[PDB]
Design a protein around this ligand. Structure first.
Ligand SMILES: [Zn+2]
Lengths: 156, 100
RNA sequence: GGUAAUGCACAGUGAAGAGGUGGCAGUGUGCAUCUAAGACUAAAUACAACAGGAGACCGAUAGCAAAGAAGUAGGUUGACCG
RNA sequence: GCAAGUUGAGCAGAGGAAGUCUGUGAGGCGUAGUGAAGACGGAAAGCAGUGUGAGUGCGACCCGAUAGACUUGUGAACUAUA
RNA sequence: UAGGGGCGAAAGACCAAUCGAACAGUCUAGUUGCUGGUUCCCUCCGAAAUGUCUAUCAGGACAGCGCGCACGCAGAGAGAAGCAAGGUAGAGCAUGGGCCGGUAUCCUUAAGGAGACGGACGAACUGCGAAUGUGCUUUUCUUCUAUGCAAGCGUAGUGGGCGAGUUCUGGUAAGCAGGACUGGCGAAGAGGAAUGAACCUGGCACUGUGCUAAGGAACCCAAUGUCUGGACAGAGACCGAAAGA
RNA sequence: GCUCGGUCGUGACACGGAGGAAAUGCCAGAAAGCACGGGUUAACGGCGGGAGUAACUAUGACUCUCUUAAGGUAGCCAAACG
RNA sequence: AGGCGAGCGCCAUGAUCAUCACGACACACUUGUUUAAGGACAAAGGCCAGAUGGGGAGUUUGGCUGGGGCGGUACGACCACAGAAUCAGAACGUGGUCGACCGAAGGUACUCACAGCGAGACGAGAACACUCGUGUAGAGCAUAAGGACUAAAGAGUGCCUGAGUGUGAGCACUACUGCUUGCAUGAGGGGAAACCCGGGCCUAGCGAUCCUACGCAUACGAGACACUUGUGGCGUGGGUGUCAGAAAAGUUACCACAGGGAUAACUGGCUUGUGGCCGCCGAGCGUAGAAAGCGACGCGGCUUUUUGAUUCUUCGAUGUCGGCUCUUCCUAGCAUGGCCAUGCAGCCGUGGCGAAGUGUUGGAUUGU
RNA sequence: AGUUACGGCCAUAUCUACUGAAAAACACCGGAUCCCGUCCGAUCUCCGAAGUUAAGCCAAUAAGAGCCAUGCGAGUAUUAAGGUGGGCGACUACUUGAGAAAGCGUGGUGCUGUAGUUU
């Protein structure tokens, strides 16, 4: 039978990668955080204070409050077939800034131009949506340089 | 476990750090005049047998170390709790490193 | 219910003429309220047998066990049973 | 139904009457909360009925133990021993 | 001589067809987490055999899944597009464990040992690493959507499950014991596998005309024939191994 | 287990003592029992292991060693007891 | 009121109240010695208190479990493995550990490594102390297992008792418990300072209501007022290992009751380890010679006639071992009939093939 | 254009042999009186310039070891969905999709930020 301590089953998780042992780099400590940013959790096994519980490893959430050397992040979780919000305390050594909003922020920068012109000249924005890839395109071909294919390889 | 007989620490009444005297807490004698003692005496009185349960299936070996510390200036007291230990000594000789 | 004794008893002990009480043990002191250890008392309250009047009750496998010579015919060694 | 209020408490007055009508008049819950308490104070329509679903206590949807106790109730016509 | 009492040449024998504690009557309609039963029609919706705690394991309670009444309302058991985490299958044998053999060379012996290397390996070896599955953001992202979702309040049943396909652990195995994932029977009829809870087709108000599925087409039994190769064994259509002429 | 003898200690309530305004506590005191010393199996019952050693081989009268409250005598047996 | 030893305790005897034996009388009490004998003792009653007490009375004698019992603990905690690469995830599945220990093995600041291997240095050897060069951890880190750590978290050296005090918010399926983190304060610590510290490098070493002991200030107190006792509030200790927490020994072959095929003792079904029977290969043996007859070391099957393994059907009942009697079936063929091989001269045999028509007995010991 | 002080990403920067280097630096170097610390001015701390490019730091070289990239291995190994496909099993063919690793070949061998100094 299995046990139920705070760091159960973390032999693979919570171990350093090959040729990457030691303390964190300066960039870790010089990064500034703000309320409302999206942030991503990855535990550093060498630091023993401010570690989250291993369920949260590799998950992304939103910063709710900022303190001297730690952050409070909001998560959601299913328990007993219902949704529950959870507020997780994490030290700054175990977090990295998330990339999940990157494309959306670029798209907002384009929208922000159009939405002004749409008051002056038009009435409503064109709004620049994405579209999924359509059907295969048409082609005009010169028809020299033909290559033949054959079952010449007998494959003993 | 070895404990020194003196400890400089914060005194709540004096509101600054002071010298304290350190010793093991002592369990005092039960009083017949309290409400629980009075109730039990009356209930036991007749031909009623044993009227309250007594524990028999006991299981623990140690009990928790508890220190009483007294402020030398104002005689106020604080209670400090230290966990379970089979044996305790006050003011013995230091555990000097690098013995023969 | 009466909680460091609410009431009642038994054995030891046992008052004062002045005493008893004021929902928590003790000692003192004012204050308030009563008078135990002798007796009597109506009305307003409770409920069988027996009599009278009523009912959104039961209608002969129901309603009392029993709408006729029913605690009967009949039964237990007996108490009792039907 | 009435509404910052609400109510068939008991009981009295009238009446050819176990119905109905009218008084007098408590109490309870509500009109704002916090603490063991001393103490303090600053949001949120309720009361009484007629019924339905559902919890708890009483035989408790219907039938069913082996047992326990109590009587100033009965038995040695069978069988044991003097 | 009488019931927690009698009487016994002792068997727990006998005390009115009753005795390892009599009979009568009452308390009493004693108690029951256990067995049996529980009385009219149609319409609409529709489960669970799991988790935590229990002198708990044939029982409870709390939560999860039904139904009724519903204030209200931009959502979704599906994809894309950016982004994270993972150490299984495969592949390998660089730290650790560990099998067999080595040329030149080296060390001694005149034996053996070491060896520039090759072959064989681990659920508790890893230097590399999938597919499938999981989460985050965006409707400023395709596609659907009101005969739809639904906070809140009140209250039921359930808490012995079993089986198929894909996989796993214990065991010589088992119509054996125990988990995980996606649909079933339970609570599911109809047509087909001759027959069969779960397999194939495919989800049921009540009628009438046409068409197809799965499976069939000498006869039983509604619909059958054609072409080309094999095969001679009371064989096959239903059916067992290593080894063989 | 039963029985006999003494206290050296413990061991109740009462009866005393000290103190305090008083209650509650504290101290002393303390029979029989218990503890301690003897008796008792036609009382309940109980009654051992290991090594060497004799002019063929075997066996061990003999020796050594561990152990106790005492280490199964006289008899009897694959017996209704192997 | 006397006496002793440098007014003290100790030794003399004289007044004041109980009081334990012993005598001698008769009045309570006792006895048919009754015109009598005993006698304040006995015997008989009463109220409290100790001792003894299966003679009796009430009651109890946990759970899980390939049926129960005996055994283990899968009953409260911790690490690793597996459970088809998030998390979760069963079995009396696998390898183990816990109920503690430590004034430093706690807090801080600085210095420097280690295990080994190759050269050296008298006694001095395999193994003594000191040096030089290499050295990614091959060492250590009190105590399981995993993770972590290198001008350190390891080894030394200095100083300190933060193993402070009030009061909030959260994470692990979250009550208890453990940990993370906010603000305010200390005539707080260490460090030049930035920084760090409210126990142990991280994941384990632990426990409610009521009662009781101690610490802390603020409350209550009955018609009034003072004090000795008492009652409230917050926080810690004393403990429930069956660990979300009753106060608890056996036996029934004399036995009762409610139920159970949720579960054993027959048969049947599935399986075939064990039991029995058959094949394949050819090392050796047979007077020569693999194979007349044998056939090691290995490998593949069939049977249900042995015994296991499992619990699907039956507990408001399917009569349980052996013998007697009587019938039918199977073949893996003991005799009887036809054949083939031979290490078949003949006689007697041995190995094989088609074949189940007819036969296969009488007794002694024993329930068999 | 190098160097030097303080850095960023942490081997294209490591490890082993050899060789070069104008200027200004960077060093080795000369002492211990004091402050400070050692069994020991070796290290650490202080006060100095008589020497020297020998060393370090910087740069080049090597069919170098190791690291980084890319091609091939290879549509190979494994795998999602499907059928009254096959096989006594052990396992495996086909249809619509996703898709490796080791080895071995070829090329590389630090790049940059702020300030100071030197033709
Ligand atoms: Zn003080």
């Amino acid at each position: 039978v299995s046990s139920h301590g705070y760091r159960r089953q973390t032999r693979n998780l919570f171990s350093q990668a090959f040729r990457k042992h030691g303390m964190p780099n300066t960039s870790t400590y010089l990064t500034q955080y703000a309320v409302g940013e999206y942030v991503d959790i990855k535990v550093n096994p060498a630091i023993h204070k401010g570690m989250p519980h291993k369920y949260y490893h590799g998950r992304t959430g939103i910063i709710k409050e900022v303190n001297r050397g730690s952050v409070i992040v909001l998560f959601n979780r299913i328990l007993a077939n219902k949704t529950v919000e959870r507020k997780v305390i994490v030290g700054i050594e175990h977090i990295r800034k998330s990339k999940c909003q990157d494309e959306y922020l670029k798209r907002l920068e384009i929208n922000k131009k159009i939405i002004e012109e749409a008051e002056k000249k038009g009435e409503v924005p064109v709004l620049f949506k994405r579209q999924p890839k359509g059907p295969k395109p048409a082609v005009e071909m010169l028809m020299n340089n033909i290559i033949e294919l054959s079952y010449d390889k007998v494959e003993s | 476990v070895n404990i020194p007989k003196t400890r400089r620490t914060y005194c709540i009444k004096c509101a600054y750090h002071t010298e304290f005297k350190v010793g093991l807490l002592k369990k005092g004698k039960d009083s017949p005049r309290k409400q629980g003692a009075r109730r039990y005496a009356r209930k036991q009185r007749g031909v009623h047998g044993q009227t309250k349960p007594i524990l028999k299936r006991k299981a623990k070996t140690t009990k928790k170390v508890i220190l009483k510390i007294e402020c030398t200036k104002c005689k106020s007291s604080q209670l400090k709790v230290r966990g379970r230990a089979k044996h305790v000594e006050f003011g013995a000789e230091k555990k000097v490193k690098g013995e023969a």
